[PDB]
């Protein structure tokens, strides 16, 4: 009981790559697990730290931030990525 709060939006994007702007409510304890779509890799991020760059990444605290954006190469991808925050 205490899942983190998150939100996925079609943040800025491009033709060769797309981006997203996730928003958090009170996830003071960052521990989400983003799941790419086989191929989509992370290129850069800001407003937060991430662990990994392909497969299963997790957000991390670095002072204070609930909204972080990240890039995602597609070159033939599809469904956008998303951040997980559930308990169990």
Swiss-Prot record:
Residues 1-88 form the CBM2 domain. Endo-acting xylanase which displays no detectable activity against polysaccharides other than xylan. Hydrolyzes glucosidic bonds with retention of anomeric configuration. Belongs to the glycosyl hydrolase 11 (cellulase G) family. This is Bifunctional xylanase/deacetylase. The gene is xynD.
